[PDB]
Amino acid sequence: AAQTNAPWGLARISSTSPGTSTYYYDESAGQGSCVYVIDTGIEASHPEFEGRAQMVKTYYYSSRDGNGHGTHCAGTVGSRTYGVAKKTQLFGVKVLDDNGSGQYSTIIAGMDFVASDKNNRNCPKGVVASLSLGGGYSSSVNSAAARLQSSGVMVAVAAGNNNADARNYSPASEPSVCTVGASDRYDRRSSFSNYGSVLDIFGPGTDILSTWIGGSTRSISGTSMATPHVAGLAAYLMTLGKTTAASACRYIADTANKGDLSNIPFGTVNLLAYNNYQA
Ligand SMILES: [Ca+2]
């Protein structure tokens, strides 16, 4: 399949080269997988999700996204126009308030919840978690992400936006998960991206067009935005029979575009997510 005039980040993940604007992919497009978007919430009634999205849990008075950030991440995972895996099921877990803030104890409970709830959903091709959140180092937070990954979910987490070594942020710094940094459309590491030994992969995260609340759209940047490109890719690749939740991260890193990013600090992987799709 080919989607012409795609967002730059979708085109980038099916290209050997920067500078093209058509997203190629296998039509199965994540059918039978499911992605949990653990964040501010998802506006499931936004036309771009076509009934494939639903809130499953909140820790606040409402399940509604009053922020936008979770709907945007959800859109890159699996909105019809702005998403990677356009036939996935999305589920939404509101662990963050409408100002984008959350306590670590609620963040940990949301991870626990997802580890169990995957047994109440029909996700034959597997389950991915997308975590566009974090903060200063916490072993309990890392331990929860580790538990979530061990249970059989493919965990993708944002490296953080401090232009710093990610070893001092959680769950960024947990070696068992897939830690994702961001690039721009010129194949440079994004200026704010974290880095270091613990990063697995880069994805597009500068000037990322996606769904927003109010049935709207906007273009925003962050390691928050890079993360759901890898999640949808993992959803996509699991539906294709190419890998499993335990192996997904490793398979993405091994089949990535190599050595094409500039602005890479010594000791950081120069690897960019790529679907390997040959029409
Ligand atoms: Ca890993």
Question: DSSP code of 111?
Answer: H
How far apart are alpha carbons 21 and 15 in whole angstroms?
9
> In the structure encoding, which two tokens stand for residue 239, read together?
């539906």
E strands along 48-204, which residues? 53-58, 89-94, 127-131, 135-136, 153-158, 169-170, 178-183, 201-204
| Burial of 142: CB neighbours in 10 Å, binned 0-12, 13-18, 19+ | buried
165: β partners: 195
Cα within 13 Å of Cα(123), Cβ side = 27
Are 245 and 127 in contact by the 8 Å Cβ rule? The answer is: yes
Are 53 and 44 in contact by the 8 Å Cβ rule? The answer is: yes
Active site residue 224: yes
How far apart are alpha carbons 155 and 5 in whole angstroms?
30
| C-alpha 178 to ligand 1 mean position (Å) | 5
**CA 109 centroid distance within chain:** 19
20 annotated as ligand-binding: no
How far apart are alpha carbons 77 and 36 in whole angstroms?
10
Q: Determination technique for this PDB entry?
A: X-ray
Q: 3-class secondary structure for 148-177?
A: HHHCCEEEEEECCCCCCEHHHEECCCCCCC
For this entry, resolution in Å reads 1.1
What domains sit in the chain, N to C, each tagged with a CATH number?
1-279 (3.40.50.200)
How far apart are alpha carbons 74 and 89 in whole angstroms?
10
> In the structure encoding, which two tokens stand for residue 107, read together?
């963040």
184 annotated as ligand-binding: no
| Burial of 117: CB neighbours in 10 Å, binned 0-12, 13-18, 19+ | middle
| Catalytic residue of the set 79, 193, 210, 224 | 224
**CA 218 centroid distance within chain:** 17
| Residue 4 falls in which region: left (phi positive, over 0), alpha (psi -120 to 50) or beta | beta
| C-alpha 173 to ligand 1 mean position (Å) | 10
223 annotated as ligand-binding: no
**Pairing mode, if any, of strands 178-183 and 201-204?**
parallel
Which helix (DSSP H) or strand (DSSP E) does residue 240 occupy?
Answer: none
> In the structure encoding, which two tokens stand for residue 25, read together?
């992919």
